[PDB]
Enzyme design. Structure first.
Site, PDB file in Angstrom:
ATOM      1  N   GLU A 163       0.815  -1.213   0.000  1.00 28.87           N
ATOM      2  CA  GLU A 163       0.000   0.000   0.000  1.00 28.87           C
ATOM      3  C   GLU A 163       0.855   1.273   0.000  1.00 28.87           C
ATOM      4  O   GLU A 163       0.833   2.041   0.970  1.00 28.87           O
ATOM      5  CB  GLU A 163      -0.951  -0.011   1.190  1.00 28.87           C
ATOM      6  CG  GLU A 163      -1.875  -1.215   1.179  1.00 28.87           C
ATOM      7  CD  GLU A 163      -2.941  -1.201   2.272  1.00 28.87           C
ATOM      8  OE1 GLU A 163      -2.584  -0.860   3.421  1.00 28.87           O
ATOM      9  OE2 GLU A 163      -4.084  -1.658   2.022  1.00 28.87           O
ATOM     10  N   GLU A 351      -5.388  -8.524   0.481  1.00 21.98           N
ATOM     11  CA  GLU A 351      -6.178  -8.193   1.669  1.00 21.98           C
ATOM     12  C   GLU A 351      -7.631  -7.982   1.282  1.00 21.98           C
ATOM     13  O   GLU A 351      -7.921  -7.289   0.302  1.00 21.98           O
ATOM     14  CB  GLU A 351      -5.694  -6.917   2.384  1.00 21.98           C
ATOM     15  CG  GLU A 351      -4.304  -7.002   2.979  1.00 21.98           C
ATOM     16  CD  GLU A 351      -3.907  -5.752   3.750  1.00 21.98           C
ATOM     17  OE1 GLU A 351      -4.784  -4.918   4.088  1.00 21.98           O
ATOM     18  OE2 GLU A 351      -2.696  -5.606   4.005  1.00 21.98           O
TER      19      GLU A 351
END
Ligand code: NA
Ligand code: NA
Ligand code: NA
Ligand code: NA
Ligand code: NA
Length: 444
Positions: A163, A351
């Site tokens: 991320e 995720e």
């Protein structure tokens, strides 16, 4: 006869600072998050990851628990401050933890997926400028190269960064995450140095030519809807989509930052870090893309200021984060990647998950039926993507266990396993029992 083939990977995910604890053991020095969590006002009730889930000491129990669930793959991150606790100072005791962890995984038939950087930058590196200092590309390269050389026999699936939107914009512009700056120009330069560091690791990886080993990156992606069909809201959604998604997808997969965002950001900050040589390194071919998916955004034009879209509440169910439960965007984003960026490249969901108000009832169970339904809806969309020809290779639920949720501390629980932090007891939630059945039957 199976909705998910025998080779499809049912996984769960964690990250080093969120679960490990043992923050001052076996040579580990502070990360930017140890430091940030000690600054007044930065983390909920001054929570920190000193102890977290104590996974560093309990990892054998936690691997046994995944084996009993039938987990097929485990995504975790490696703590740079355990491996290089000081600049240029390798710590074999740090590496030894990840060897015994991955040895335990492999001996219990769990495939390791290792995230090299999941936000726990060593404090010594930040003190030298951190991601704002272009020399970090070499520090990160030296770290990644040490991992590839020491763990290549253990780990065959590598993720350079988790991320980078968070490590750049959320950490340097919005200021919610470590080190907590609030400067658009800094966040933009950090985004570039993160991507360049990713590129250096890929260059090193390819030079090693490790047998049967794959490298990728993990991006948190959403889908942005305009609140109405107006021109104002279409531009608002374009900017929001460029800010979250295309700013990273385009340099990685097109070799070029999105020009509309370069011009937009250029009205507010310098964008002179862009150059051909760096974008060539950034855009090196990857083996897979990891997608972190949670929610969508519905946006309305704001007041002509910097990134000031109004967040619209469409009135649907939400998690305890305030995130809309909108499973169709999982399918829409995977399809968008197939049609606009990654084409036939393997994709993993690295995720997906949700935070709900979990309570241990008097029967000792956690009846998290909202999470059961959340996961069920999202795996149904993964199945629909597969049946529509998408190249999805696995799905990692965030998270194996409740853990330290960054600026929220321990107040947000994402686990399929509940952790009673006083005792460090693990309690399987009903979502874990549901997931166990999904892996066993491969049917939904
Ligand atoms: Na920790
Ligand atoms: Na603290
Ligand atoms: Na690629
Ligand atoms: Na691959
Ligand atoms: Na939906």
């Amino acid at each position: 006869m199976l909705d998910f083939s025998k080779d499809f990977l049912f996984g769960v995910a964690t990250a080093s600072y969120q679960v490990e604890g043992a923050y001052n053991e076996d040579g580990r020095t502070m990360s930017i998050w140890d430091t940030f969590s000690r600054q007044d006002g930065k983390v909920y009730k001054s929570h920190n990851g000193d102890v977290a889930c104590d996974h560093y000491h309990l990892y054998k129990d936690d691997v046994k628990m995944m084996k009993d669930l039938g987990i097929e793959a485990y995504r975790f991150s490696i703590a740079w401050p355990r491996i290089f606790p000081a600049k240029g100072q390798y710590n074999p005791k740090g590496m030894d933890f990840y060897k015994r962890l991955t040895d335990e995984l492999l001996k219990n038939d769990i495939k390791p997926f290792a995230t090299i950087y999941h936000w726990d930058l060593p404090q010594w590196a930040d003190d030298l400028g951190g991601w704002l200092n272009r020399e970090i590309v070499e520090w990160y390269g030296e770290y990644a190269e040490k991992l590839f050389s020491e763990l290549g026999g253990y780990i065959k699936n590598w993720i350079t960064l988790n991320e980078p939107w968070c490590s750049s914009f959320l950490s340097y512009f919005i200021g919610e995450h470590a080190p907590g700056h609030k400067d658009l120009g800094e966040a933009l330069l950090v985004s570039h140095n993160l991507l360049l560091s990713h590129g250096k690791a890929v260059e090193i990886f390819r030079g090693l030519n490790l047998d049967d080993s794959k490298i990728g990156i993990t991006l948190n992606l959403n889908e942005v809807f305009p609140a109405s069909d107006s021109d104002d809201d279409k531009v608002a959604a374009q900017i929001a989509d460029g800010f979250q998604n295309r700013w990273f997808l385009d340099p990685l997969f097109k070799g070029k930052y999105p020009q509309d965002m370069v011009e937009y950001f250029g009205k507010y900050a310098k964008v002179d870090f862009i150059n051909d040589e760096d974008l060539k390194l950034i855009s090196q071919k990857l083996d897979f893309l990891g997608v972190n998916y949670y929610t969508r955004a519905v946006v309305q034009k704001g007041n002509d200021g910097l990134l000031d879209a109004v967040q619209i509440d469409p009135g649907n169910e939400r998690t305890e984060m305030g995130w809309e439960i909108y499973p169709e965007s999982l399918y829409n984003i995977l399809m968008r990647l197939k049609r606009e960026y990654t084409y036939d490249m393997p994709l993993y969901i690295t995720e997906n998950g949700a935070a709900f108000n979990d309570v241990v009832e008097d029967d000792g169970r956690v009846h998290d039926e909202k999470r059961v339904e959340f996961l069920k809806q999202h795996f149904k969309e993964a199945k629909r993507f597969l049946n529509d020809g998408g190249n999805l290779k696995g799905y990692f639920v965030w998270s194996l266990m409740d853990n330290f949720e960054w600026a929220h501390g321990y107040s947000k629980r994402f686990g399929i396993v509940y952790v009673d932090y006083e005792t460090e007891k693990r309690i399987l939630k009903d979502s874990a029992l549901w997931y166990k059945d999904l892996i066993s039957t491969r049917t939904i």
